[PDB]
Paper text:
Tetracycline destructases (TDases) are flavin monooxygenases which can confer resistance to all generations of tetracycline antibiotics. Type 2 TDases have thus far been predominantly identified through soil functional metagenomics with one sequence found in the soil-derived human pathogen Legionella longbeachae. These two types differ in their resistance profiles, with type 1 enzymes conferring resistance to all tetracycline antibiotics including third-generation drugs while type 2 enzymes are generally limited to only first- and second-generation tetracyclines. We determined the X-ray crystal structures of two of these new sequences from Legionella species, and confirmed anhydrotetracycline can inhibit these enzymes’ inactivation of tetracycline antibiotics.
Tet(56-2) and Tet(56-3) are most closely related to Tet(56), at 87.4% and 87.9% amino acid identity respectively, and have 88.6% amino acid identity to each other. Tet(56-2) and Tet(56-3) were also identified in the genomes of Legionella species: L. clemsonensis and [name], respectively. We determined the X-ray structures of Tet(56-2) at 1.80 resolution with Rfree/Rwork of 17.43/20.93 and Tet(56-3) at 2.39 Å with Rfree/Rwork of 21.69/24.85. The structures of Tet(56-2) and Tet(56-3) show that the FAD binds in an “OUT” conformation, a conformation that was previously confirmed in X-ray structures of other type 2 TDases. The FAD-interacting residues are conserved between both structures. Most residues in the FAD-binding pocket and the substrate/inhibitor binding pocket are conserved across the three Legionella Tet(56) structures. Intriguingly, L181 and T183 in Legionella Tet(56) enzymes are replaced with V181 and A183 in Tet(50). Similarly, the addition of 1 μg/mL anhydrotetracycline reduced the concentration of tetracycline required to inhibit the growth of Tet(56-3) producing E. coli four-fold, from 32 μg/mL to 8 μg/mL. Apparent IC50 values for anhydrotetracycline inhibition of Tet(56-2) and Tet(56-3) were in the low micromolar range (0.3-30 µM) for tetracycline and doxycycline inhibition. Together these results suggest that anhydrotetracycline inhibition is a promising combination therapy against bacteria producing Tet(56-2) and Tet(56-3).
Numbering used by the authors:
A (entry chain C): 3 to 387
B (entry chain A): 5 to 90, 97 to 387
C (entry chain B): 5 to 89, 100 to 387
D (entry chain D): 2 to 89, 98 to 387
């Protein structure tokens, strides 16, 4: 199985499928557009059947070792006055094998699992073509490589999806919200605490977990505005500075340190709707194919499942990408629908701030806990040895 | 450090192993669709046996050694003139079997067949390679191990910088069905500056034919197999003996090989980020009997000098050329020394012939140990 | 988990590899001072060939396979009568490969167990040098004459069956200058062979004969050679030249063709594998293949039981019973006509041989191997 | 590889450390522990000097950094609880228990038998006879003791003429209790009358670690009798005040009680035949040196390395081991004595003088921690 396979994107789906592809006898090559591993991102939750895959890969103990250590959580008003304080109650109500871990720590654990897999950074594809025999990949530095299969794991803004799929074959659905997170110097000397302030359909957060020198800032807000270019960091940062102008609290102290952050992340809360995630010798995995959006809390787990099934089906098809890709599209269909529908469900209430009572709030919260456990296990994983 | 190695013969695979063991990540290509296993018996000799032991393949090679029990020199009619019945100085092993052993040591290294380069450029930062299938790849280093007719040397070095010297003789060998039911025996017939051999060793169904003759003729296109075979037939048109029985089975052969006995002469074997190893740089010719050994030493030293220099190819390449020079000269000079009498068939005393044979065996023994290997641990 | 494997033959090394591959840390002991590489050509066949593949030695076994190119049957005066022109490998070569596969497993030599006891917690093993060790499990692979079987199992729980024949084989210098040939001479229900495979300096001699006699002490080497010389006193041909060179041979082997019949091969925390539990005898040609399967299944069942030997040993006996019966019975089937020399033509003999080839292939695949990762 | 039968006694720091390096070098050791589970007691330790390089080559440095102590505030208080002072080179501070855990996770491929202990040892020129508590008799090519200051193996193998235990005039005790004060990432300490009482919390919010250190020339009738230890500790702190009675009341709820005199082991050599002492069993530099764990690191490294360098020839290996460690043991043991000249002496001095003594202590331990150049065994 010396089949040439290209995997685009050193995020979560990308590194995960590289491990499984190698474990099943294939020889993948991994590329990343940025000069180094992007370890940004808020805390993620490895949950449901994804924990089972994590245990199979042999990383579940590492993930448990690098789990979030926040000891206290405070919601405050714009004056800093405490309204609600928690000390870990949130984690009790949740699923059993769920583990919360900062995204970059999870990516680092995944990158250590594929140290024997080639990985080239600062590598950008400019165009892709394919025929019955091979895929042609053209790189910005002048290289032209031929591959038997190409797998895209470059995120919801997948440039591969745009180079391979027509506009009539994929739809991006805006859920009326935006998310941003970045690390800054811990100017508040916070220790194992998360502070959040919600007002006027906006949320501002700042936390400290392990590194006492660094704090992670977070912004979430409702909006239907669309950027001229969702990939222009300068427009992203200006839009964030304008929406949170006059919010008060620690917003300006946070945004003033935004320029010295090395892990900036900003995106719209969006979903990718496709009838198929494969075209010829090219397959999409993770957010590139079926992003459930941050509001589902399931993007990383769907990345895990999609990587395992695609690599497994290729093993079961003895390299017949025609059959594997077809089974891949079918097996993941119910799981994608459950998770994406859950995400839309959450968006109906997210930051709405409708004047509801504790009864209404507790019912939505408990129904979210039940709904997310069923969704996280909405599929039974096959076996491939 | 991305490294391309060109040619899956002896030098190529062997340097892939030594680059991998020293930490590098080589990639190998081969022009032909499958590994080429043709060739006559070769000898792993001298300091090259030490390299083989360090590679962990010495026992395997010994296990695959030739097992010819009898060697008969015969006249054109079949009458036996001379008969013979024949160490860690030397292990004789058919070329194909040694190639197989080398390949099995680099199963973790990617090897791409039916792949050949049409253009090669380099700057101070990388080498750019354009392949026949339209691919373009950048490499930190390119090591050419594509043999005497190396296209890489032709595209990188000017006509001024290399010279191919014809030693006035030709070689051809191929396997045919063992129609004579030979068993661990080699039959040879020499006459009129020509030699015809046929042997059976390890596969009872297969016999290996061999032709060697003196000639100062040069083919119009040495790459044309049709010309090669036509020239071979014209040269042995009426040699007699089993010549026709052998040539008529040539079309059934899967491993036909034919070439002139040639040496490659260069003052340096490197240019920028591109280095040559094996026959592509310093072919000692079949008449030296040391090509594969000089390929082992060339691979081991080049990989080691890249390790000792921490990837500074400038340092490693200069060290490479210097350390290899005395070993190349001794082996090429021995090759030419052999060609002075090869198939000349001068009327000499049986004592003289025996004496020149003793001197040849003594000379190759010393030549095969002409340098001390550096240690790279 | 402390696990003791007794015997560095074929079954022993095989189960050590598998136990290690499944997470255990076995220890291997051997009665003799060094590994015993004696023996004639054996055949890896049937499901055993798949286990060899999963162990990563199949190609190694192929590389060291036999290379005999001609077989001649000859009369006592040297005149040829007949001439002829899955992997066959000499026992010593296969034992080499298996020992290379367990370089991470300790092997202590010159070790002899003298007493064995067990309770529901551990097995206690007494050694001749005075050591006393407790083990969670003890696995016996000490061959047909298993001292462990005799110490653990009552005389009514096992039966030794003599198949009425003997076998001896040893390597001597190649004084005849044989090259890749096997010369055999059959007469009076006795067979004498001498072959040369690869090493041109050595020839391997073989002796086989029918007999109902039993030795006073089957492990006494002097009585073995006396019985051998008396049996071939006036056979003629090369018997004297071969037997006169026994003293310079370093790998003398002699044994009776025997089987071991048991209803169960485990007792508490002790398990038998290989010839010690279900020896099918040389006439079956499946001893080494039965060693492979026993080692594979026993280790696998232990892994699946997460160390619970009660479940593993129960499944070990259950899964192996069909395979053992077929191979043991196949061996008895061969003995009824082995060296008997019935009055039939060569078309009948070659007909029986064709039946044997079909039968042995079915028997060598007479079970389906479970999977354990 | 090597399949020499090697027994390593003691699952602390030196023991697990040497099991790793022996296996890395081609050996197959076996580990035993007297107690039924791994002992994770003890105060914070410092991985320092050349011991940091050994930890890096073991691939545990980041794990050690990951579990580094994270006390945010340190308050020194009087017997009434009033705060008198509040505090806010590749070396890492880490609780001893967490370092033992890490080390046991680097030897997961080596057998480790708990509730195992030796009753007697014999040896001849061919093997060592180790007789076990559960009735086993085993022969070993090499036996390596890492069973601590009161090494039962040393007392079985070495005569009282070959080792000397030096009392440095002080005693130490530490044990975990329920965090009845509800402390978080803080260390509370109180010193008076040549006694020091501490109580802190770092990671487990339900558990606090108590500390006791005092000066005394008294010697226990039997140093291994816990009852005499605690009776001595309670009588020493009878009228101390502060939290001493609260802490010592919760002693019976502790699972990791540690009590010991601050002592050193003085031997001319650390080997006899096929038996070798490593760690505190041979050259314990005392807690006042702050180097026991690091000396255990270097001892395990050099003994294992010299055995590989001599291809299992214990005669040659034991000779290099004794010679090479001598200068390092000398500097660390001497530094521990030097600390004891001022430890808890409480001399009337300026805060400039006390500061100067601390600066000198830090500069000295820096050099003592790098007092030898490590050999390379590749
Ligand atoms: C830096 C970062 C921070 C994030 N933070 C959050 C967060 O706080 N909350 C949340 O819910 N989700 C976040 N996400 C998204 C989250 O990772 C995904 O929703 C999901 O968990 C994993 O999906 P994925 O691995 O398929 O895609 P991603 O995690 O988005 O990974 C895609 C990877 O491909 C790389 N890439 C993109 N384009 C190219 C290209 N042309 N060539 C090569 N490589 C390319 C990207 O740099 C990235 O490393 C973040 C993603 C990133 C990259
Ligand atoms: C099929 C064959 C048979 C031979 N038979 C004999 C013999 O009988 N006697 C003798 O003395 N010597 C023989 N030789 C030459 C002998 O192997 C060499 O003299 C020496 O032993 C090894 O040198 P080398 O590995 O550098 O070159 P070679 O052994 O010649 O190996 C060169 C390899 O590079 C490949 N190659 C060539 N051009 C290209 C290209 N443009 N791109 C990619 N790959 C390329 C070739 O297919 C071959 O696999 C033979 C070589 C070959 C290839
Ligand atoms: C030297 C030798 C030569 C053989 N030659 C042939 C042959 O030519 N043809 C044939 O059909 N079969 C032969 N056999 C038997 C053959 O190996 C088996 O039938 C089968 O292939 C493998 O069975 P086994 O590994 O269970 O037992 P064996 O191969 O017999 O191995 C048993 C091992 O246990 C050891 N052992 C015995 N008693 C003790 C003890 N008390 N303590 C510790 N270790 C002990 C033995 O020394 C031996 O190493 C031979 C066996 C041996 C040992
Ligand atoms: C529970 C405990 C707490 C400690 N607390 C401190 C502290 O607060 N401050 C300080 O400076 N030092 C402390 N030490 C000592 C410190 O670990 C050493 O100074 C050094 O760090 C490591 O030396 P070592 O591993 O050689 O010895 P140790 O750390 O003492 O390790 C000895 C090990 O051997 C085991 N053992 C003892 N006798 C036997 C036997 N007969 N059979 C089998 N195993 C046996 C012990 O249970 C222990 O696991 C403590 C040691 C222990 C065991």
């Amino acid at each position: 199985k010396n089949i040439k396979i290209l995997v685009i994107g050193a995020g979560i789906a990308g590194p995960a499928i590289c491990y499984w592809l190698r474990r099943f006898g294939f020889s993948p090559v991994l590329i990343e557009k940025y000069a180094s591993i992007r370890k940004g991102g808020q805390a993620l939750d490895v949950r449901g059947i994804a924990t089972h895959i994590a245990k199979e890969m042999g990383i579940y103990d590492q993930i448990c070792g690098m789990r979030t250590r926040i000891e206290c959580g405070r919601f405050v008003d714009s004056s800093g006055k405490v309204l609600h304080e928690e000390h870990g109650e949130k984690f009790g109500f949740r699923q059993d094998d769920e583990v919360e871990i900062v995204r970059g720590d999870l990516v680092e654990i995944l990158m250590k699992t594929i140290t024997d897999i080639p990985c080239y950074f600062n590598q950008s594809i400019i165009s892709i073509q394919q025929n019955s025999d091979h895929v042609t990949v053209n790189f910005k530095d002048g290289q032209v490589e031929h591959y038997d299969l190409v797998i895209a794991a470059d995120g919801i803004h997948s440039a591969t999806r745009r180079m391979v799929f027509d506009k009539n074959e994929y739809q991006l659905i805006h859920l009326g919200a935006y998310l941003s997170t970045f690390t800054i110097p811990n100017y508040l000397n916070l220790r194992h605490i998360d502070l959040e302030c919600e007002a006027n359909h906006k949320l501002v957060s700042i936390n400290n977990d392990n590194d006492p020198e660094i704090a992670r800032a977070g912004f979430m807000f409702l909006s239907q505005h669309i950027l001229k270019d969702i990939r222009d960091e300068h427009e992203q940062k200006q839009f964030l500075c304008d929406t949170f102008r006059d919010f008060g609290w620690e917003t300006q102290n946070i945004l003033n340190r935004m320029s010295e952050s090395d892990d900036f992340y900003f995106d719209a809360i969006t979903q990718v709707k496709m009838n198929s995630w494969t075209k010829g010798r090219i397959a999409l995995i993770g957010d590139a194919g079926y992003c459930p959006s941050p509001l589902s809390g399931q993007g990383n787990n769907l990345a895990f499942v999609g990587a395992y099934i695609l690599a497994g089906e290729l093993k079961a098809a003895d390299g017949n990408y025609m059959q594997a890709f077809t089974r891949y599209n079918a097996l993941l269909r119910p799981f994608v629908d459950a998770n994406q529908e859950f995400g839309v469900w959450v968006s109906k209430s997210f930051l709405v701030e409708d004047e509801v009572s504790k009864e209404i709030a507790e019912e939505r919260s408990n129904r979210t806990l039940a709904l997310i456990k069923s969704v996280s296990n909405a599929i039974t994983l096959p076996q491939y040895e």
